[PDB]
């Protein structure tokens, strides 16, 4: 399961941020097992934090500083799990993680994206 992501992402402050995570899995994705793990971490030393996932339906945990700004904007059936960042601020600058597990393919996918904000 290769993951197609842009390593570095520069988005203008206050604009919309398209954060594309995609994969090419040869097996038909079926919603009754396929899982998406959406996590982010700032500095390597500081801890990873989870904000979105997908077990049966799209789950948003509505976090502090991630409140009312993140919604799922992709559809897993066509291998697109992109998300949007509404009206980016300087704060969300950091390193974004999309973890994909698509059974019955055993290999657990992993995309990494660096998001930077320009004034």
């Amino acid at each position: 399961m290769e993951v197609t992501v842009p390593a570095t992402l520069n988005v203008l402050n206050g604009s919309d941020a398209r954060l594309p995570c995609t994969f090419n899995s040869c097996y038909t994705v079926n919603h009754k097992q396929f899982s998406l793990n959406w996590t982010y971490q700032e500095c390597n030393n500081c801890s990873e934090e989870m904000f979105l996932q997908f077990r049966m339906k799209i789950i948003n945990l509505k976090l502090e500083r991630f409140q009312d700004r993140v919604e799922f904007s992709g559809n897993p059936s066509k291998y697109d799990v992109s998300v949007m960042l509404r009206n980016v601020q300087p704060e969300d600058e950091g390193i974004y993680n999309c973890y994909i597990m698509n059974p019955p393919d055993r290999h657990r996918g992993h995309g990494k994206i660096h998001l930077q904000v320009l004034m």
């Binding site: 399961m1 899995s25 040869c26 097996y27 079926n30 009754k32 019955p104 393919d105 055993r106």
Partner: protein
């Protein structure tokens, strides 16, 4: 002109264009011998030294006018060029151009560009190149680029007759270098990488003498036009038949009748995704992917109690085996024509739609899988032969156009020709038979004896090597080609002694040393040497093709097979046959060549797309099969007559065994007389009237007809005795009494013959001996029955010889007699060939039993059948310690293996036939050591044993057999005058007459009716475009029949119905107008008769079908009556001519195959009764199940028909070998009968199936010969 060599100079430039100037001021084929590429003739002799590889004047008169030049090598090779400057830049004396020629006209150039390529390939063989290989990639690109460059600035890009781009093969180097630069600069790439494969096709360019090979393959393919057209046509027609009959049939599955919480078929079928989910609602046998089929009839599969037969779900085998749509029917019947695992289609269709649909599968195997294949092998052969013949003609025409000395001579007198050689050969045979006595549970004493023997023999052979080596000088000793062999063998022996298992077994090839006194083995050596000799280039081409397809398969599908493994294997691990390595890709390509190409293809498609899998496999198969057929044919025809023509005497230096044998008749005959002389020195009318009566009566046709009817009644009465006899009690009594009557009449027959012909003439005829034995069997059985001795052991195993009763039929049916005489006249030879094949397979079998013996044991969890993983339980003691605490664990072998030379011969018969070899390779390449639990492909590289084996035992031996058979048949035909040896005297009249039907060219052109209107109709119908149109609309109707599918729609069904109605109407109309035109002459044309018939059947069909569907209910009869339409297609044959002739060949050939079919049917009858008697009570296992078994005449004739093509015979044979529990149970109850025990007898079973497969092989060879000679006779006429 021997001495006309002039340096091509400024004057050459000077003179040429004013020659061409006057040609264009005034407005013969070139010398074939001097045309570039070939060799310089001897007429010009040797070349001045400094003139070699220089610009020279042009020799050929045709090109003399135009402006060219030629450069000649030190290898006397013609390289022609054009004197126009390269790109209008490089004049023929530019210094760069000279040195460029010097490179191009140089052999080391070819040596370099070949040493690069033959390493580029080895670099292709890796699937995951390391990072260091970039350097190699770049250097390779550089070498190809500049070696193409040195061509450019010498040969010339495009401005010339001879310029680079002109040769087709310089297309390929250009395209590969430009793509390599491209992909390197445009930087999935898998398609682009596939074209890097293309590099290794420059191999054909570099090495000489494959240009001609590939040209030959192209020109030989060019001839299979009409046969491929007819193959497409016939496959399509049978595809329509199969589509009509079985549309949707294989979609049956048994669905439980007890659904809880308010569901239906549909309600579930929308919400289902698993194999487990389908298991909870359908019926799956243990360990299967597909759901068990079922049928709506009494002769179909039977659903378990609790389930009902419904049509729903997905078709079997991932959905690819079907008759649903025209394309899938095409695929299924192509699978039938190539007989690739067709028996599974056989069982699936029969379980789905019933047993009585066996006729369909018979008509196809007889026609499609035989008549097409023969037409192909005959066309290819016929082409090949024409080329060999022309080639030979041309070759011929062109040719035409002090103490040391003392004891060395002493040892040489101890070379004594008559005897020491015989001592050595008997040492050879004693060795080989001593080494054919290994086996696995072999005691230490046998071990010792065998070891000691090997040592003594080694010693003797070595001793003779050293003795003869001192006898005469090594300078001549190592000249005799057999000498090098022996020395080699002794050296190998010494190395073995002082250190692999495979190394133990190079002492076997000494069996060829008997070839000196063995002429058939000399034939075999002629084949083996030929394939590396005068036809070694074609074998190299086969190696190239296998490499190309191997690496292409790897490059395309390799990754796929690794990302998508879970679709094709449940444990999420790669399958057994995959394309993710070079070696495994090679194995799959080899398997495709042998003929088992679906199952791998299903996996292929299931992971990597239908289109690319299909194109590859079809192409692999076609190209490979063509090249292999060409190799086979070549060798067969070279060895046939072109090998040798008795140019030298029979063993010119009279054979040492023949020198020895003289000393034997010198000895035995003389001593026979010495003991003879010494032992003598020491010491009335009435009877003849009875005879003439009995003679007269038995000849009378009334008597003969009586006896034939009697024989048929006996034969039929045998078939009622099956498992169900206790149910039909009245039939049981009737059959006993009829058997008693029958034996009575037959002994009266014997008595009348005895008095008629006399004891003598009756005892000196074979048929009377056969009948005598048969009636003896009957008499003994009868008397023992009436004396109470009716149950005592052998007298019950003598009753089972009643099955021989049909064997009286052969003496009454002419065709049977003629076939039997034809097949008996060729046994003497076949025996010698067979015995060579046996000694050869014996060498292979000892190789086997040395490599594998005793290592196929493995613990098996019998509940599911999964061998315990070699993490825990790696060995015996562990398997036993496990059984004592767990259960259903066994240390189980394969039952067909290499534990000794005999089982070795059996397992080899399986491998050389490809029917059941798969489990042997799997369990061999897993082997570790005796008493060891195998590991998954722990010895991967044993498959080469099987590849080598396959190559020699199936490819050369089949060649040898075919060669001898043809030769004998030629003898059996030539001696008697060209008469067909499979036809009776009336059949000959018929054939001669049927021949004159294919020879009438002219007929009167049907005078034109007077009246104007009908005259217009006439000149309409006889016009050329009338038929053209009608056949165009025939194709337009064929497509209307193709467009159907499964569950299409209501609207579509009607709309096709209406097109059909319109076509029917036009056709009927044409018929009527035609009739009106040729009034009273319509029937002079047989094709027009056919037509009338089809139009009528078709109208009838439409109306009747309508009637039945509307009022009656009969699905099956509806479908079988809707097949009247198929006739409308058969008129495509009318317009064709490339097909008419071929089908007329089949019509010519029919009666011969009729007689072989009669013989085959009688043999199948006898074997059916034998199986009915013995194997009706065996367990139900691999090939014997609830529907295919021997419990009844229908079932047994089905099973035997299946294995007539040798298909799946291992599956039937496997459950008969079991004996001595836990394999079987000898105390079974078998309700409704008094028989006990449920397992068969190994020896009789092996005899049964082996015997059958050889006899079937022999009759189908005769069928082959019949059709092939018929095709030669028609085509050369």
């Amino acid at each position: 002109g021997p001495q006309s060599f002039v340096h091509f100079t400024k004057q050459s430039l000077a003179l040429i264009e004013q020659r061409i100037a006057e040609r264009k001021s005034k407005e013969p084929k070139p010398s074939s011998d001097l045309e570039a590429g070939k060799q310089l003739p001897f007429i010009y002799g040797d070349i001045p030294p400094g003139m070699v590889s220089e610009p020279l004047e042009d020799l050929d008169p045709y090109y003399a006018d135009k402006k060219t030049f030629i450069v000649l090598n030190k290898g006397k090779t013609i390289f022609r060029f054009n004197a126009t400057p390269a790109l209008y830049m490089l004049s023929p004396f530019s210094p760069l151009r000279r040195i460029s020629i010097k490179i191009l006209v140089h052999s080391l150039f070819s040596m370099l560009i070949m040493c690069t390529i033959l390493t580029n390939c080895i670099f292709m063989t890796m699937n995951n190149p390391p990072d260091w290989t970039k350097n190699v990639e770049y250097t390779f690109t550089g070498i190809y680029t500049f070696e193409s460059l040195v061509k450019i600035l010498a040969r010339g890009f495009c401005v010339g007759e001879f310029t680079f781009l002109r040769d087709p093969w310089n297309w390929l180097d250009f395209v590969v270098i430009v793509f390599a630069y491209l992909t390197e600069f445009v930087n999935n790439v898998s398609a682009l990488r596939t074209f890097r494969v293309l590099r290794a096709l420059k191999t054909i360019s570099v090495i000489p003498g494959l240009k001609t090979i590939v040209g030959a393959l192209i020109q030989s393919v060019k001839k299979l036009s009409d046969v491929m057209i007819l193959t497409v046509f016939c496959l399509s027609v049978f595809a329509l038949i199969g589509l009509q009959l079985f549309m949707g049939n294989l979609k049956h599955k048994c669905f439980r009748n007890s659904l809880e919480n308010n569901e239906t078929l549909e309600s579930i079928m929308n919400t289902l995704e698993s194999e487990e989910d389908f298991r909870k609602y359908f019926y799956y046998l243990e360990g299967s992917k597909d759901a068990l089929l079922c049928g709506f009839s009494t002769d179909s599969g039977q659903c378990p109690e609790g389930y009902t037969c419904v049509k729903i779900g997905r078709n079997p085998d991932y959905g690819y085996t079907s008759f649903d749509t025209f394309s899938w029917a095409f695929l299924a019947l192509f699978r039938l024509m190539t007989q690739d695992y067709w028996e599974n289609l056989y069982q699936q269709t029969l379980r789905a739609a019933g047993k009585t649909y066996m006729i369909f599968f018979v008509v196809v195997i007889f026609l499609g899988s035989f008549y097409l294949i023969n037409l192909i092998l005959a066309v290819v052969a016929m082409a090949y032969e024409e080329q060999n013949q022309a080639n030979i003609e041309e070759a011929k025409q062109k040719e035409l156009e002090p103490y040391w000395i003392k004891f060395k001579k002493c040892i040489y007198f101890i070379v004594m020709d008559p005897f020491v050689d015989l001592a050595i050969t008997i040492c050879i045979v004693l060795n080989t038979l001593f080494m054919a006595m290994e086996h696995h549970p072999m005691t230490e004493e046998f071990k010792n004896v065998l070891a000691i023997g090997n040592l003594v023999f080694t010693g003797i052979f070595a001793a003779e090597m050293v003795l003869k080596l001192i006898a005469m000088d090594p300078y001549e000793y190592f000249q005799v080609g057999w000498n090098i062999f022996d020395s080699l063998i002794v050296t190998l022996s010494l190395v073995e002694l002082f250190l692999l298992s495979v190394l133990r077994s190079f002492r076997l090839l000494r069996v060829f040393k008997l070839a000196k006194s063995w002429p058939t083995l000399n034939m075999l050596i002629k084949i083996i040497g030929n394939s590396v000799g005068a036809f070694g280039n074609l074998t190299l081409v086969l190696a190239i093709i296998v490499f190309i397809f191997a690496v292409v398969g790897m490059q395309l599908f390799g990754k796929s097979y690794k990302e998508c493994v879970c679709k094709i294997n449940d444990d999420c691990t790669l399958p057994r046959w995959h394309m993710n390595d070079f070696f495994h890709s090679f194995l799959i390509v080899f398997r495709v060549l042998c003929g088992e190409w679906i199952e791998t293809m299903w996996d292929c498609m299931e992971v990597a797309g239908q289109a690319m899998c299909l194109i590859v496999y079809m192409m692999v198969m076609v190209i490979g099969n063509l090249v292999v057929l060409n190799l086979f044919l070549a060798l067969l025809l070279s060895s046939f007559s072109s090998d040798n023509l008795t140019a030298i005497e029979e063993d010119p230096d009279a054979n040492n065994l023949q020198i020895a044998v003289t000393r034997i008749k010198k000895g035995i005959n003389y001593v026979k007389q010495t003991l003879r002389e010494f032992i003598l020195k020491a010491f009335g009318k009435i009877w003849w009237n009875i005879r003439k009566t009995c003679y007269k009566i038995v000849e009378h046709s009334w008597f003969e007809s009586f006896i034939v009817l009697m024989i048929l009644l006996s034969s039929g009465a045998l078939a009622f005795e099956d498992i169900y006899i206790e149910r039909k009690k009245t039939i049981k009594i009737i059959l006993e009494y009829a058997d008693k009557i029958f034996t009575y009449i037959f002994i009266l027959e014997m008595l009348l013959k005895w008095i008629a012909y006399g004891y003598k003439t009756y005892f000196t005829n074979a048929w009377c001996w056969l009948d005598f034995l048969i009636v003896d069997v009957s008499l003994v059985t009868l008397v023992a029955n009436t004396l109470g001795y009716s149950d005592l052991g052998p007298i019950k195993s003598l009753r089972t010889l009643r099955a021989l009763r049909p064997l009286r039929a052969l003496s009454r049916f002419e065709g049977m007699r003629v076939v039997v005489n034809a097949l008996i006249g060729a046994i003497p030879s076949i025996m010698n060939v067979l015995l060579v094949c046996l000694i050869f397979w014996l060498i292979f079998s000892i190789m086997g039993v040395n490599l594998f013996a005793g290592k196929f044991y493995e613990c098996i969890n019998t509940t599911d059948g999964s061998r315990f993983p070699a993490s825990q339980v790696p060995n015996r003691s562990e398997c036993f310690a496990l059984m004592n605490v767990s259960q259903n664990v066994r240390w189980k072998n394969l039952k067909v293996n290499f534990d000794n030379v005999g089982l070795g011969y059996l397992s080899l018969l399986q491998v050389a036939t490809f029917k059941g070899w798969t489990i042997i390779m799997y369990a061999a390449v897993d082997s570790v050591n005796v008493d060891k639990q195998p590991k998954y492909e722990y010895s991967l590289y044993m498959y080469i044993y099987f590849v080598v084996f396959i190559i020699f035992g199936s490819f050369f031996t089949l060649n040898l057999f075919i060669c001898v058979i043809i030769d004998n048949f030629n003898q059996q035909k030539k001696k008697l005058g060209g008469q067909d040896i499979f036809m009776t005297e009336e059949q000959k009249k018929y054939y001669n007459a049927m021949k004159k039907l294919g020879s009438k060219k002219p007929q009167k052109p049907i005078p034109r009716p007077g009246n104007k209107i009908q005259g217009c109709i006439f000149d309409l119908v006889t016009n050329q475009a009338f038929d053209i149109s009608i056949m165009v609309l025939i194709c337009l109707n064929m497509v209307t029949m193709m467009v159907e599918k499964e569950g299409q729609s209501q609207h579509m069904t009607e709309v096709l119905y209406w097109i059909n109605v319109v076509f029917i109407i036009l056709f009927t109309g044409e018929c009527v107008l035609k009739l009106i035109s040729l009034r009273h002459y319509y029937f002079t044309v047989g094709w027009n008769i056919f037509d009338f018939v089809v139009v009528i059947i078709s109208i009838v069909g439409m109306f009747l079908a309508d009637l039945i569907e509307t009022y009656f209910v009969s699905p099956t009869l509806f479908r079988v009556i809707r097949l009247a339409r198929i006739g409308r297609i058969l008129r495509l044959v009318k317009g064709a001519k490339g097909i008419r002739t071929l089908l007329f060949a089949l019509m010519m050939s029919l009666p011969a195959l009729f007689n072989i079919g009669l013989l085959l049917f009688l043999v199948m009858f006898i074997y059916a009764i034998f199986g009915m008697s013995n194997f009706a009570y065996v367990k139900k296992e691999d090939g014997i199940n609830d529907m295919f078994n021997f419990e009844t005449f229908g079932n047994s004739m089905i099973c035997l028909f299946q294995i007539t093509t040798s298909a799946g015979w291992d599956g039937l044979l496997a459950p008969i070998l079991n004996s001595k529990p836990p394999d079987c149970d000898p105390k079974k109850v078998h309700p409704g009968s008094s028989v006990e025990g449920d397992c068969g007898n190994p020896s009789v079973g092996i005899f049964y199936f082996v015997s059958y497969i050889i006899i079937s092989f022999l009759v189908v060879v005769n069928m082959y010969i019949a059709v092939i000679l018929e095709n030669f006779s028609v085509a050369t006429e």
